[PDB]
């Protein structure tokens, strides 16, 4: 019964949001852009969405009228626009989409591409990492300036990027013998399986309790220090890892001599693991997803790491 | 019981060969290379292979000993190494893998990365596209020079690249109103769903009838002219497309001014659609996959194209 349009449908979190919307029973539309011409994995992803019952809606960010038409078909718009420097960081292209939603006036709610650190709380961040949050703030201001109802989904580290590698930056796999601990390893971080993030997103987008709210993904058992996370892995494997503590000053040593996109990653890591930006404030149960949606049995990080044994 | 190592397991046809091996009941091992540790889609494909019961084998082409250890674990090695200019064209990297197989001596059968035009019939091909056939030929020679037993799988266009788009080079989707027909559109081409390619591959690799043989994938109902292909699509949509015929000379015009990848593609298309290299010769029923494996209900191009409706 709720009609949903996913923008960024073939993206990392986008494709999960699409499937979650189908499973939740939303009538699900996905935007197929003409520019994805010889990108076979995108094309075939769209084919798989259609087989599961999504509806293809052709549109382009170079064709304002195509965007107006698309969002005229649905009640809710979810954007999963890219926002990682080593991938691509086109958060501002959502501005065109805000303007199309504005012109069409039928959208009952818009979920912009957030799913990360809470932007309005990042005002002190260092560039170039800072650009992520500034751009997402700009999109927020366009949404609110336009009076578009919204939900902002924030709060958790994607497990594949922070959990599966024991938060080592070099890789996505657990380390074999040795691991770096950022500081003392006693800063609480929030970790969430991306499938759960998508499930929460599909459940909130028509939850009246979250209209015009920020929704935090902070599943209580998944608030863990890096050392706790590394110890979960030592338990599963039965092998202690040689741990080396990294003081902040040595984490950041010579950052100015590194490629921009890596500086941005280092900056994001610093806010999460050294400042603890994901756990340094309180949120109430009325604005936290696992409490809003307790039927969702989120995947705990011991189960998540097991798939790597 | 037959133990198969797939090299190139996350590639386009490779990932399908992995699943087809599992579905066939082979004990299926997949080479996980260290170099792909930061590519999230490859990493998560390996997790997904693992969940289906595939066995991860760590190895690196830059580590001759890791390869020898890897091939020693299995009865059959299948290589799906990249060989397309606008993606990646590392056919000759297989030579390091042939070396490892020769040294290890336990390997009963090797399927090199073929899966297309029959290299030994392409002596007259257009440079630079010629490279694909010269490099696979060089790999064949190393194989036979080592006395490694082989099966060469050849002879069909991948449906995604030549049928889903009605053979329009620009795209992977059917055109909306107009289509280019190459020549008179009456040259016969072989089309095959890539999942059927993978299935025939899984079935042939332990088949005595194809030891040391070329296996042709030429499913009779899928031997189609381009006009025949286009008429399938017009019958599905019920809309006639506006057709433009393109003479060979205009198709090849100014090719020497094209980017090298597009030079390659243009050349391959020419041999397929203008010279009919996939159907200019006959093959026997004892060397044709659909005849050897009539249990396989191969997908016809009308069923294939329905996905796009
Ligand atoms: N730990 C965490 O909490 C994480 C949070 N994030 C955040 O999640 C959100 C999405 O990130 P992610 O999934 O990695 O994004 P992706 O890199 O996967 O890209 C997502 C989509 O953005 C679309 N896109 C890219 N460029 C353009 C363009 N010029 N014009 C139109 N569309 C474009 C594409 O949509 P299409 O399918 O139509 O081609 C693409 O699929 C971001 O806000 C990111 O900051 C991401 C990683 C970690
Ligand atoms: N119409 C037809 O008949 C078609 C024929 N083909 C043929 O199919 C075969 C496979 O092509 P395709 O699926 O497109 O291949 P891909 O481009 O998808 O690459 C396949 C694998 O090659 C590996 N690879 C690439 N570079 C290297 C490298 N330096 N070192 C080690 N491994 C590397 C990777 O293995 P890993 O997973 O370990 O990273 C990659 O997954 C080719 O011979 C191609 O000519 C392809 C398209 C159409
Ligand atoms: C946790 O909130 C966010 C988290 C990200 C995570 C980004 C995820 O991809 C991460 C990453 C970057 C560089 C790396 O070398 C890396 O190694 C695992 C991971 C990024 C770290 O910023 C991006 C935007 C956010 O709002
Ligand atoms: C059919 O036998 C082969 C076929 C290919 C197909 C290549 C597949 O990727 C194809 C492709 C290239 C450029 C394009 O613009 C394209 O548009 C669909 C398709 C290539 C056409 O040559 C490669 C090697 C072969 O041996």
Author numbering:
A (entry chain E), B (entry chain F): 9 to 317
Q: What does the paper behind this entry write?
A:
Pinoresinol/lariciresinol reductase (PLR), an NADPH-dependent reductase, converts pinoresinol to lariciresinol and subsequently to secoisolariciresinol. Here, we present crystal structures of IiPLR1 from Isatis indigotica and pinoresinol reductases (PrRs) AtPrR1 and AtPrR2 from Arabidopsis thaliana, in the apo, substrate-bound and product-bound states. The crystal structures were captured in the apo, substrate-bound and/or product-bound forms. We found that, for all 16 structures we solved, each enzyme adopts a similar head-to-tail dimer conformation, strongly suggesting that each PLR/PrR functions as a homodimer, consistent with the literature that TpPLR1 exists as a dimeric entity in solution. Each structure contains a head-to-tail homodimer, and the catalytic pocket comprises structural elements from both monomers. β4 loop covers the top of the pocket, and residue 98 from the loop governs catalytic specificity.
In contrast to IiPLR1_NAP_ + PIN, the β4 loops of AtPrR1_NAP_ + PIN and AtPrR2_NAP_ + PIN can be clearly identified. These well-defined loops twist as an “8” shape and cover both the NADP+-binding and substrate-binding grooves. Within the twisted loop, His93 and His97 “grasp” helices α5 and α10, while Val92 and Phe94 interact directly with (+)-pinoresinol; Arg95 strongly interacts with NADP+ as well as each of the GXXGXXG motif and α2-helix from neighboring protomer of the dimer. Similar β4 loops are also observed in all other AtPrR1 substrate/product-bound structures, whereas each β4 loop is disordered in the corresponding IiPLR1 structures, which indicates that the β4 loop may participate in substrate selectivity and, hence, catalysis. Furthermore, Leu46 (corresponding to Val46 in IiPLR1), His276 and Phe277 of AtPrR1 are positioned similar to the corresponding residues of IiPLR1 to effect substrate binding or product release, except that the β4 loops cover the substrate/product, which are disordered in the IiPLR1 structures. Importantly, the PrRs have more strict requirements for the binding and orientation of lariciresinol compared with PLRs, so PrRs cannot efficiently carry out the third step.
